[PDB]
Amino acid sequence: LVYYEGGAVCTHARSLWRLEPLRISWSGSHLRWGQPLRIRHVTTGRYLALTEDQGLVVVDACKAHTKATSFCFRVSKEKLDTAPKRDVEGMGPPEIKYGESLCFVQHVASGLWLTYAAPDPKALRLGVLKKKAILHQEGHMDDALFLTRCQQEESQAARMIHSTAGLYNQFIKGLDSFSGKPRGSGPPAGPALPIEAVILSLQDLIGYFEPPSEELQHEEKQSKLRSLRNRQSLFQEEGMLSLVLNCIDRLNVYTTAAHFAEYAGEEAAESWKEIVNLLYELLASLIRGNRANCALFSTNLDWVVSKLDRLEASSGILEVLYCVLIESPEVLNIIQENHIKSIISLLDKHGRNHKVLDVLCSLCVCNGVAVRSNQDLITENLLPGRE
Amino acid sequence: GVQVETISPGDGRTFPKRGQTCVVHYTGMLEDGKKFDSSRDRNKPFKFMLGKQEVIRGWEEGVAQMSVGQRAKLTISPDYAYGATGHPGIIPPHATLVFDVELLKLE
Amino acid sequence: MDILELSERLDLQRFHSHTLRLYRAVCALGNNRVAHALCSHVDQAQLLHALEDAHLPGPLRAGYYDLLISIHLESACRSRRSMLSEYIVPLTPETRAITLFPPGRKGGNARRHGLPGVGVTTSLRPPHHFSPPCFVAALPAAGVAEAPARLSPAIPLEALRDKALRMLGEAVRDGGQHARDPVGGSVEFQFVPVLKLVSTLLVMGIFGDEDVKQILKMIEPEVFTEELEEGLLQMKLPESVKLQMCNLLEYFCDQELQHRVESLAAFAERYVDKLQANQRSRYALLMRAFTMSAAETARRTREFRSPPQEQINMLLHFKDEADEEDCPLPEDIRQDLQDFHQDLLAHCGIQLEKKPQSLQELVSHMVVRWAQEDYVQSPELVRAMFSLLHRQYDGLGELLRALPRAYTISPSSVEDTMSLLECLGQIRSLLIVQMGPQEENLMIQSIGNIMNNKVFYQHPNLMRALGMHETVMEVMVNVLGGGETKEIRFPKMVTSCCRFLCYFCRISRQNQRSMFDHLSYLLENSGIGLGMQGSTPLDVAAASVIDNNELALALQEQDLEKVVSYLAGCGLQSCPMLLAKGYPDIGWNPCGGERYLDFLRFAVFVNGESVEENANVVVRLLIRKPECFGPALRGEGGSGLLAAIEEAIRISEDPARDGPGVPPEENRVHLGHAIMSFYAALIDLLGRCAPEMHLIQAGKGEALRIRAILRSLVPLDDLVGIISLPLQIPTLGKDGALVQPKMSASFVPDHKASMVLFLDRVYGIENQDFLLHVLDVGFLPDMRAAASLDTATFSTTEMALALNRYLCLAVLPLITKCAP
Amino acid sequence: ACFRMTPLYNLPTHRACNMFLESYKAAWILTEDHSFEDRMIDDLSKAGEQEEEEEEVEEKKPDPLHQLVLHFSRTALTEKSKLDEDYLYMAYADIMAKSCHLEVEVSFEEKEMEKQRLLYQQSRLHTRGAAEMVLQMISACKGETGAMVSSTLKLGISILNGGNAEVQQKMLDYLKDKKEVGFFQSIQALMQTCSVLDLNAFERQNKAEGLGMVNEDGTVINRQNGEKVMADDEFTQDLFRFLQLLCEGHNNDFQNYLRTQTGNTTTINIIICTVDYLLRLQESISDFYWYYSGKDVIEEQGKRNFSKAMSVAKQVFNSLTEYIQGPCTGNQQSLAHSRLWDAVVGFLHVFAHMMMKLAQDSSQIELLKELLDLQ
């Protein structure tokens, strides 16, 4: 469904759209009034369409059959429609401008105009800033739209999100397909998992979210950090982080590579460990330096502490925890003795690692504020034993 | 659980009395042998009055059985000591406490 | 092993350094209990040995220095630094003796500055408090959050300062030798810990005059000699050491400022004495000589009639020499002030050899030389050095900005002032840490002690200078913000937060203005505090605006709109806390609505008269958002006010509609009473918004509007019906057991009182027929009931008291006015 | 109470001492004039030991003032949600702004000497990177009024006075290479925040002063409250003077950049924003005219509020004039198709009626003169 909405949606990717002229050749030509075109949602791959059953929606490409998805921009709502158009080789005249021009979207076949649904009263009580978009022959005066340019970074990020969501969901699909079905003394009996594609995507995303080097000058570091925070927020708002957590859960159900092989085979068992480490590293990259993304873990802190003991990606899980605890005090306020004792047990079982000490230090003070409960718990459950 | 052993003898005739401040040096060790307190590290004798419950029972009874100039080892059960609650950070719960006490003088 | 093997065993060094970091973290920011616990693991002997040990790795050396500071000195240093910015001068002979310059023959302008940090300081700073570390003491039987707050562990401060000075001198000589084996492995590892400890000790005030002189000579002997060695300034040191030196020099410059303030206060004492004597003598002479000339006596007596502040202003108004003649004061008194002013300008350097000869010149030259010599890569060092340079170039401005934080007290208030300062230090410390049961108890205790202190009431200006209200404010809002949606914890703390602030506004109008300045800040936090019963930030705002026409007129449209938005939310949405408690689900929140309505009442109606500017705004906003009126008075599909009240009484009779009915507090909400009180408050607010009559006679169209709108909103018949509604009356029955109506769950006279106010202010009683009608239907019955209850058994009943209050407040004045 | 007012000699010593502290502070310390700005700037500009080094000049090591400017630029460029108030920044910005100006027929030679000196003082700063710091702070403020942005604007005005083409070019080059929308976004937000005459505030203040409330402690008759009406008049004038100075000298490039920013993803038309503010000011002035229309004589508070509004409008008119002079045809067309004509109509209405009304009373001749100058 399509809505007019204001707020952070303006900066978010789901607000982004791509214009696709019906012609392949010279499709990058200047848009001109009356030009039939398709409107695509980058993060979903779905095209704006008029469906008789549900009216204005976004449908899949397989159902996008031009007539439903063909739209035009007109400067005026008058029913001129005098002449059908003529294809022109080349870029053509520069008619429509960013920011200045006011355009009305019209479904070519029906001729209907894009407009708001005229929300009923009590929507103010709902506090919804969302106005459902409909195709109405009369329309409204304020139906005009301003076209606004999008950064290359945002466009790239949205397309990345679409591709990554597809790939990871296919992966989760294979995992669920052979979840409860042991391969026995035979094949896993299911479609091959995209192991190499997942690995390459994870590596590229880690490099894409890599923080700027310290040697860089202050201004450049600030610019890269701003871009990184923006990209992190876009991915989080499109739900990549939850997808990573889901993949990690389904991979965690299997304790070891042999246990994984029993269901999926040795060929995937080799890359099990690499994939889990890459996933934890990607999660750390996504949340690092972003207080909101680190605060999201206040609800499911146990998600990390329960997994700390696992040996395959102990360092990655610990880095995730470290990032969360630096960025967010909300987690520090919800810490419990169980968590403190789990971290102390991590010291006991894995060895004397200064990173755990750093994590414990972060548990105490954040942003110049100390948590006496955490301080006392650490003191009581670490110091007296003296081992 | 107060059990007193004599490391070095004292006068043997002068013993602490109620309302009489006892001045001591002490080193505190848990039964496993870990030190948790020592007045000598601070270089200041510890003074406490008997019958005011300022110190634990272990001390109250042990110093009373002790004599001026006497050095002794006091072993104290948890009940006479801080006990199940313990001393957070310093002393674990249900810990027997071993002390080396030198009773300097009475005042 | 020997800890010195950690020079080659790097992993162990790293782990132990981070262990020391953890020790500092657990004891950080006031955990004196954790500090005491640590004193067992790391003893005084260990720490002092590490301080001197030259073979430790620098990481461990710095860690141990910082651990000592954290365990022993951090809390005291922070508490003292919080107070250094404030200057409270007791009027004492010591203060009187203070002079900007030490006694000498050399001329005022030329007079060589005294050594900074060496002199008599009378400014009040509360003492440090420490508790000995002991682990054989009896365990306090008091439970957690009841046991008193523990003090920091004690360490021998005189020995520590002596050791620090000696070690610093050793470091200076070693740097002069330029050896290839620096302590810790680097000049930074050698110097920085010592300088940090020295700065901490200076701020704490441990160092004496001779120790300060030694430190000054270590810094730069030539400049600071009073009446070879190479100083740290020329020792050509790295950036971190420079930062520490900058902090030291900041301390010394602060002491110079403090000396200036104290000298000014001393001169103020002496000069005020002289002026007072002269004014007395001149008044006596005038009362002797008024007989000759009666005309000029008026202009003369203008002085003795003017406010004392204006008298002082006039007496001091002789600087420009153009208006000196009008000033009564003689030339000697004037010249004393002129001389002191010149001396102050000289001390600050304004008044007109290569070697500095002064701290200001030394600091300026040092900063410029450092920047010239190298491009500093430390932003912190850049900030500090340029701050020092600004202070040196602008001494008058720094004093001018410090003066607001200056206050003179009598010597007889020192003890109470010190107790208040200790309580304020506790409160200030409570900001950094997250609030808990312990911190809440300490906060409540500090507030109570401050309230008991007389100085709080006597010296509200000093309180504002100290910034106490802002601190309380910040604590409260910080507590609220955390998990505000789930629940508002520490309601006892918030209730104390009014009693403090919601009385502080009453102490003085200036205090009330100061709290008014933060009105918007209070209102945004006020939204969630609705459920939490007691004194609220909404009450803070009401106290800030109550009975002050100036503040009410200053009040802002945006704040009114925020209040109205909250009220509309209440009128359209139920209270989730009540729903969770199982109350029957209605669509709106009368309790919060009533809270906001009474706030708007206090805003619009002041000293018995309405403020039309705010009243018209409130009316317009309310009519724009009609949901604020309640489900009744809605218009389409809306029941009348009388019907709403009747339904509320029905609910009150019927349980499972007033509440769940399945209470230790006894303050459980009764929905019928809540609805009736909401409507009563609404009607009261509208009546108060109603124009005053003189405007009506004037014919003000806006007034006529507002009155017509109010009449349209509330029909008279409904008011009369509500007034006529019966009230449950105490009676003895079933063996003479007294049957008495519960007020919290029943219709009560103040509900009628609001209606009467509305009737009087909007509709008015101009016709005898309506007069008699109202009196026969509603008033006379209630007066008869009150008279009937005026019996031994019934006279003291809360119901009878409420009836009498209703009568005297609303009815009887009205009948008195309508007597003709 | 006025009769009872205690003589000074009857007060406690400490309260009298406090009162003396405040009075001395106001009369003597506050009135004292000490000038250290130029000395500070020179001492920070001078570089030492580079003469003996003979390589340091070619190394181009920052001198102390350059380092200070760089420090402030680093603070501005640091990524933060909001711009924290920095008293050090405000003080140093004030010092530089004071140093830049450092200030009945004047000889052509003397006039040119003042111009050349002002150019040297401005060079001291914009050679060290003050223009970029100004722009960075304006972007950082993110549309929130305050002492920080006020000081930044004053510094910009000081370095731009006389239409410094060098500073203009540096600013434009920085903006065009960085391609940041935050600068103009902050400018737009500040314009939107800029205030106009408020009749409700006028009436509230009138009643407040009529009440004649006296401070309960001691006595303060007719205590002067904060001026609600045109509180940010100085900030508004500084903003529009800054925008004017950026275009001073008929700088076509910056004039067109104000209308449109080709490189940036989004564009903001400062000319249209100025027109909108002028329209709001016109509406306020017309309302206040109607308010005083029945009243025969304007009183002093009004005469004020009129004068402040007409000063702001004068600055706005001069800024709009400078946007188009040269001429900039695009800016001319934008204004022609904008809402400027309605503002001119309202101003003409007010001018005519105020002229007729004020001619009747001679005491209002100064206000009449200012009105005529605005026309």
Rounded to whole angstroms, the Cα distance separating A63 from A69 reads 9
- Give one DSSP letter per residue of C555-624, joined into a string: --HHHHHHHHHHHHHHHHS--HHHHHHT----SS-HHHHHHHHHHHHHHHEETTEE-HHHHHHHHHHHHH
Asked whether D204 and C554 are in contact (CB, 8 A), the reply is yes
What are the residues whose beta carbons fall under 8 Å from the beta carbon of C777, sequence distance 6 or more? C720, C723, C724
Phi, psi of C207 (to 5 degrees): -65, 140
Does residue B90 have an active-site annotation?
no
The encoded tokens of residue D2 equal: 């006025």
Please give the structure tokens belonging to residue D306. 């009129």
The amino acid occupying position C107 is: G
- For chain B, what is the domain count? 1
Nearest to C149, CA basis, from C26, C23, C69, C32:
C32
Coil/strand/helix, residue A51: strand
- Which among D77, D266, D267 has the least Cβ separation from residue A219? D77
Contact C152/C76 with Cβ under 8 angstroms? yes
Q: Would you call B80 a catalytic residue per the annotation?
A: no
Cβ separation of D27 and C316 shorter than 8 Å? yes
Q: What gap in Å lies between CA C164 and CA C151, rounded to an integer?
A: 24
For the four alpha carbons of D99, D101, D107 and D112, in that order, the dihedral sign comes to positive
Q: Which two tokens stand for residue A106?
A: 């019209």
DSSP class per residue in A165-186 = HHHHHHHHHHHHHTSS---TTS
Q: Give the Cα separation of A305 and A338 in Å (integer).
A: 9
C-alpha angle with apex B20: B14 to B25, nearest 5 degrees?
75
3-state secondary structure of A369: strand
- Residues C621 and D163: their CA atoms lie apart, in Å, by 49
Is there a catalytic annotation at residue B82? yes
CATH of the domain at B53: 3.10.50.40
* Cβ distance of A361 and C22 shorter than 8 Å: yes
Query: Are D74 and A149 inside 8 Å of each other by CB?
Result: no
The encoded tokens of residue A361 equal 């230090």
The pairs formed by C750-753 with CB atoms below 8 angstroms and a separation of 24 or more are C750/C680, C750/C802, C750/C805, C750/C806, C751/C645, C751/C676, C751/C677, C751/C679, C751/C680, C751/C722, C752/C722, C752/C723, C752/C725, C752/C778, C752/C782, C752/C806, C752/C810, C753/C680, C753/C684, C753/C805, C753/C806, C753/C809, C753/C810
Q: Map residue D50 onto helix, strand or coil.
A: helix
Strand partners, D121: none
Verify cis geometry, omega within 30 degrees of 0, for the bond prior to C148: no
Closest Cα of chain D to A164: distance in Å? 27
Q: Which of C117, C349, C102, C361 is nearest to C227 (CA)?
A: C102
Q: Which tokens hold the place of D32?
A: 């004292």
D13 touches chain C (CB under 8 A): yes
Inter-CA distances, C37 with B90, C436, C532, Å: 6, 20, 38
Q: Which residues pair with A132 in a beta bridge?
A: A3
Nearest to A355 by CA among A307, A312, A309, A323: A323
Residues of C with CB under 8 A from a CB of A: 11, 14-15, 17-19, 21-22, 25-31, 33-34, 37-38, 41, 432-434, 436, 438-439, 482-483, 572-573
Q: Which range marks the domain in which residue B106 is found?
A: 1-107
Residues D343, D282: contact at Cβ < 8 Å?
Answer: yes
319-358 in chain C: CB under 8 A from chain D:
319, 337, 341, 345, 350
Residues C101 and C320: their CA atoms lie apart, in Å, by 26
Give the number of A-C residue pairs with CB atoms closer than 8 Å.
71
Nearest Cα to Cα of residue C591 among C649, C665, C676, C504: C676
| Pairwise CA distance, residues B89 & A385, whole Å | 9
Gaps in chain C (C to N over 2.5 angstroms) fall after 227, 352, 662
> Which residue in B68, B92, B104, B81 sits closest to B3, CA to CA?
B81
**Which of D67, D71, D78, D79 has the highest number of chain A CBs within 10 A, making it the mutation to test binding with A?**
D79
| Helix ranges restricted to H, C374-413 | 379-393, 395-402
The DSSP output letter for C627 is G
DSSP β-bridge partners for residue C733: C737
Catalytic residue among B15, B37, B46, B48: B37
CA closest to A386 among chain B residues: B34
Chains touching D, CB cut-off 8 Å, 3+ pairs: A, C
Method used experimentally: cryo-EM
C165, amino acid identity: L
* Chain A residues close to D265, C-beta within 8 Å: 148-151
Nearest-CB residue to C137 (from B55, B85, B89)? B55
Q: Which residues pair with C443 in a beta bridge?
A: none
What distance, in Å, lies between the first and last C-alpha atoms of chain C?
Answer: 106
User: Token match 């927020």: residue?
Assistant: A233
Nearest to C393 among D36, D64, D217 (CB): D36
Q: Which chains touch A (3 or more CB pairs under 8 A)?
A: B, C, D
Q: State the alpha helices, DSSP H only, in C100-156.
A: none
* Discontinuities after residues in chain D (C–N over 2.5 A): 103
Work out the minimum CA distance from C393 to partner chain D, whole angstroms: 7
Return the H-helix or E-strand segment holding A365.
strand A365-366
Are there at least 3 beta-carbon pairs closer than 8 Å between D and A?
A: yes
Contact B85, B94 (CB under 8 A): no
Interface of A with B (CB under 8 A): 376, 379-380, 383-386
Cβ-defined contact of C43 to B38 (cutoff 8 Å)? yes
d(CA C653, CA C656): 10
Please give, one letter per residue, the 3-state secondary structure of C403-459.
HHHEEEECHHHHHHHHHHHHHHHHHHHHHHCCCCHHHHHHHHHHHHHHHHCHHHHHC
Distance of CA C782 to the CA centre of its chain: 48
Burial status of residue C729 (CB atoms within 10 A of its CB: 0-12, 13-18, 19 or more): middle
Catalytic residue among B15, B36, B46, B48: B36
- CB neighbours (10 Å) of residue C93? 10
Half-sphere exposure of D367 (CA within 13 A, CB side): 25
- Phi, then psi, of D342 in degrees rounded to 5: -65, -45
Residue C154 DSSP label: P
Q: How far apart are CA C584 and CA A142, in angstroms?
A: 44
CA–CA gap between residue C588 and residue C579 (Å, rounded): 11
- Tell me if the bond preceding A93 is cis, omega within 30° of 0: no
Nearest to A218 among D74, D265, D266 (CB): D74
Helices D147-160, D87-101: inter-axial angle, 10-degree rounding: 20
By CA distance, what is A385's nearest residue in C?
A: C41
Q: Do A376 and B88 touch (CB under 8 A)?
A: yes
Does the distance separating the beta carbons of C37 and A379 come in below 8 Å? yes
Instruction: Tell me the C-alpha distance between C568 and C628, whole Å.
Output: 5
Instruction: List Cα–Cα distances, C378 to C235, C240, C249, in angstroms.
Output: 19, 8, 18
Do A229 and D79 count as a contact with CB atoms less than 8 A apart?
yes
Binding residues of D for Ca(2+), as ranges, are 248, 322
Parallel, antiparallel, or unpaired: how do β-strands A71-74 and A131-136 relate?
Answer: unpaired
Can you tell me the distance from the alpha carbon of D236 to that of D229, in angstroms, rounded to the nearest whole number? 13
Q: What are phi and psi of D28, to 5 degrees?
A: -105, -55
Interface test with C, best of A347, A364, A381 (most C CBs within 10 A): A364
- CA-CA distance, D67 to D74, in Å (whole number)? 10
Q: Is B48 a catalytic residue?
A: no
Of C621, C515, C524, residue with least CA distance to C571? C621
Q: Closest chain B residue to A379 measured between Cα atoms? A: B89
Q: Cβ distance A363 to A342 under 8 Å?
A: no
The three-class DSSP label of residue C708 is helix
Q: What is the DSSP letter of D223?
A: P
Strand, helix or coil at C785? helix
- Specify the 3-state DSSP secondary structure of D198: coil
For residue D332, what are the CA distances in angstroms to C183, D318, D324, D344?
Answer: 73, 14, 6, 15
Residue C519 sits at φ, ψ, to 5 deg, of -60, -50
How many whole angstroms from its chain centre is CA D58? 39
Residue with tokens 């972003």: A290
> Encoding tokens for residue C271?
């000069």
Give the C-alpha separation, D37 to C812, whole Å: 72
**Integer Cα distance of C209 and C215 in angstroms:** 10
Give one DSSP letter per residue of A278-319, joined into a string. Answer: HHHHHHHHHHTT-HHHHHGGGTTTHHHHHHHT-STTHHHHHH
The residue among A325, A332, A354, A374 with the most chain C CBs within 10 A of its CB, best to mutate, is A354
Looking at CA atoms only, how far is residue A190 from chain B in angstroms? 57
Sort D96 into a burial class: Cβ within 10 Å, 0-12 / 13-18 / 19+: buried
Strand B46-49 and strand B21-30: pairing? antiparallel
Cβ atoms D43, C368 nearer than 8 A? yes
The alpha carbon of residue A211 is apart from the nearest alpha carbon of chain D, in Å, by 14
| Contact call for A369 and C26, based on CB within 8 A | no
Give the burial class of A266: count Cβ atoms within 10 A of its Cβ; 0-12 exposed, 13-18 middle, 19 or more buried. exposed
* Kind plus residue range of the DSSP H or E element containing D324: helix D300-324
Beta bridge partners of A369: A366
Chain A nearest CA to C675, separation (Å): 21
The C-alpha atoms of residue C33 and residue A373 are separated, in whole angstroms, by: 12
